[PDB]
């Protein structure tokens, strides 16, 4: 009978969601003028990797970015001058994530080892060394992010989000309320709470302090491949395996408006907002990226310079550049 | 016009270019294999003849070839999300047990293994990477209902699942009590390298 009770609760929650859907973000912003066609050029290309790259993350200074390849390497690129600060060799090549700590001292990576190796970049010995190896997952580790210099958050193929603790190496909390897999997560500018993706076409709003999902968003269709909050942490744009970027709301608890184009039928693998939030750059399974106006739902300049699937991208903290990394082993800085 | 410090920084960045290039060069001579199959359908015994909680990278050598055999059995997640991770693999060693039609594990193990082989062989990533079928565990195996004819029919049923002219499935039959499973893989890998070099020449 509990299944029927759950169905009734779902019906009442969706009725409540519909009761607060007077506007669709397209009836509004008509008076707002459209953004001019954004022309973006490859300012710098980072041709150092040798195989597919599955993640990149910008430092707080917006000058250093760490990328993970299948060569078995993390590389800490100097974005402004295309220099390799650190070439971290991994124990196991199959890595599918990165995380540059808010302090430039710590980095993380691990995708199929079930473990997010945490590397220390500021050591008296002068070489990057594995500061920790967190082993508590039973599936591929899709994404990991840093809250502080310690106390990271990871999501793995075993349908769990961790919230590790670097000093002790143990599960500080655990986020097990997820029916399907998880592929990517995004943490708020204030790290009190974050969200995680899925493979059951949903996104969950996890609270870091007390482990639970405060809100769930199942309006999407096929899969989730990337998440990123709106700056100020109120609306996370979601990835898609059906070429449909969407941004939900933490307060309205519902989807605002879907971003789709019948021209392209592919799967997003990475989404990141702009600094102000007008742009919603998404790297598609279409050998390129795209720029979406976050308020008019329209399209903008297409950023096509890649040879394979665009696997990662991130707008800098100061919002100056947007580097994208694809399976062609080339990180391209776009400004 | 770079400063004294930034010239040294560029020297370091160029000196770890050489190390990375050498690491990539030394990691391309070896050949990577992806080991797949049904649930414990002769995987463990074959892996034993060749030589956490996720991949198991067996790392062996034979006749100057360096085989890196990645076994993925600890992954309880969907194969779709991490299957493209092995796109640049030389061959996929598909282990299947002949004593599988008797068991049921609704659908018998033969039907499940055959459907899974079809799904793997028709993945868009593995449209050019060849399959090495190991028809292992043939001792318990036993138109005509004799051992050889039924075994040949099973081989044909497995081999019929490809639909590309540039993809070749290599089959072999073992009693799981022999040392030939490295030689068979070596011969198949030599054939795969020969075919890859032929298609690189432009003549198919």
């Amino acid at each position: 009978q509990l299944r029927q009770e759950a169905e009734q609760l779902k019906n009442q929650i969706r009725d409540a969601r519909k009761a607060c859907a007077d506007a669709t973000l397209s009836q509004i912003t008509n008076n707002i003028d459209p953004v001019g066609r954004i022309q973006m050029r490859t300012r710098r290309t980072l041709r150092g990797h040798l195989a597919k790259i599955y993640a990149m993350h910008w430092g707080t200074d917006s000058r250093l970015l760490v990328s993970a390849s299948q060569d078995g390497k993390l590389i800490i690129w100097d974005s402004y001058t295309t220099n390799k600060v650190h070439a971290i060799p991994l124990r196991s090549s199959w890595v599918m994530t990165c995380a540059y700590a808010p302090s430039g001292n710590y980095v993380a990576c691990g995708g199929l080892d079930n473990i997010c190796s945490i590397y220390n970049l500021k050591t008296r010995e002068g070489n990057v060394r594995v500061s920790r190896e967190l082993a508590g997952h039973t599936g591929y580790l899709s994404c990991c992010r840093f809250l502080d210099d310690n106390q990271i958050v990871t999501s793995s193929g075993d349908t769990t989000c961790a919230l590790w603790d670097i000093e002790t190496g143990q599960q500080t909390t655990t986020f097990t309320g997820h029916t399907g897999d998880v592929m990517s997560l995004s943490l708020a500018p204030d790290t009190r709470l974050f969200v995680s993706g899925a493979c059951d076409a949903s996104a969950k709003l996890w609270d870091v302090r007390e482990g639970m999902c405060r809100q769930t968003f199942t309006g999407h269709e096929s899969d989730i491949n990337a998440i990123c909050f709106f700056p100020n942490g109120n609306a996370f744009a979601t990835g898609s395996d059906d070429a449909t970027c969407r941004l939900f709301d933490l307060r309205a608890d519902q989807e605002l408006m879907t971003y789709s184009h019948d021209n392209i039928i592919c799967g997003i693998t990475s989404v990141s907002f702009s600094k102000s939030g007008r742009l919603l750059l998404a790297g598609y399974d279409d050998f390129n990226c795209n720029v979406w106006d976050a308020l008019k739902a329209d399209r903008a300049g297409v950023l096509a310079g890649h040879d394979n699937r665009v696997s990662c991208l991130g707008v800098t903290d100061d919002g100056m550049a947007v580097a994208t990394g694809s399976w062609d082993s080339f990180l391209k800085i776009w400004n | 016009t770079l400063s004294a410090e930034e010239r040294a920084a560029l020297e370091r960045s160029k000196a770890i270019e050489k190390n990375l290039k050498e690491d990539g060069i030394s990691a391309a001579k070896d050949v990577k294999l992806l080991l797949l199959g049904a649930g414990e359908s002769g995987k463990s015994t074959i892996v034993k003849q060749m030589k956490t909680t996720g991949i198991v990278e067996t790392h062996f050598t034979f006749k100057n070839l360096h085989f890196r055999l990645f076994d993925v059995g600890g992954q309880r997640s969907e194969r779709k999300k991490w299957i493209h991770c092995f796109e640049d693999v030389t061959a996929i060693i598909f282990c299947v047990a002949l004593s599988g039609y008797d068991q049921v594990l609704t659908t018998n193990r033969m039907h499940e293994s055959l459907m899974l082989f079809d799904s793997i062989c028709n993945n868009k990533f593995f449209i050019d990477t060849s399959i090495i079928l190991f028809l292992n565990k043939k001792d318990l195996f036993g138109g005509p209902n004799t051992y050889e004819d039924a075994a040949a029919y099973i081989q044909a049923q497995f081999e019929s699942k490809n639909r590309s002219p540039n993809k070749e499935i290599y089959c072999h039959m073992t009693c799981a009590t022999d040392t030939n499973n490295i030689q068979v893989v070596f011969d198949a890998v030599t054939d795969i390298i020969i075919a890859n070099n032929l298609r690189g020449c432009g003549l198919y």
Partner: single-chain antibody
Amino acid sequence: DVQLVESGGGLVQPGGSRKLSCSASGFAFSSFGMHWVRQAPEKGLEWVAYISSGSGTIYYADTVKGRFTISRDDPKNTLFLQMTSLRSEDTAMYYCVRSIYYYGSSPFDFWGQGTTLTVSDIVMTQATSSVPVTPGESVSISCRSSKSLLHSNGNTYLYWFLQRPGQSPQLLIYRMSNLASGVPDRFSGSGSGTAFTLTISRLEAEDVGVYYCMQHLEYPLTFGAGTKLELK
């Protein structure tokens, strides 16, 4: 532990030769650039030589180029300075210095001990050679550069070093905006592209050693005269 120890602590006849070997164990020697820094019976501090991470980038002080030859080996983690044609002015106690050059790195982190020996170019000045100050009071040390030391890249390659009395100096501030590892927060430096000033709030009895200033725009590196702090 991390340390660099020296070997050749012996008297040398004038017009001779010697070999100084220093061994380091704590860090990854092959990934560090290495320097050499001289001294004298006087408080003078002067640059000697340099070798890069890959041993492919060698520089020298223009006052002695062609007399000292520098080298190093990674298998034994040992850095060598072969001294040829020693004069009377070569007397010093040679410090070995590690320095790794990448964005955000701090060159000149660790200075090992040294063997005492007995027998254009940017110029920096520090007029306040003696600052008698009691503990607990803020202290200001000024260093002046002859060339605009603010490069076009936004960095200012200035280094401030402290030396405890009778100890190897430790780097205090690099680029007059960042503090070295382990340096107390009370230290603080700043300045324009020509003048540089420290603000040592809450001076203690440990912060008494002599201070040196260094420019780093060009490898013809020049140290500044020391500003000894006393208890008068």
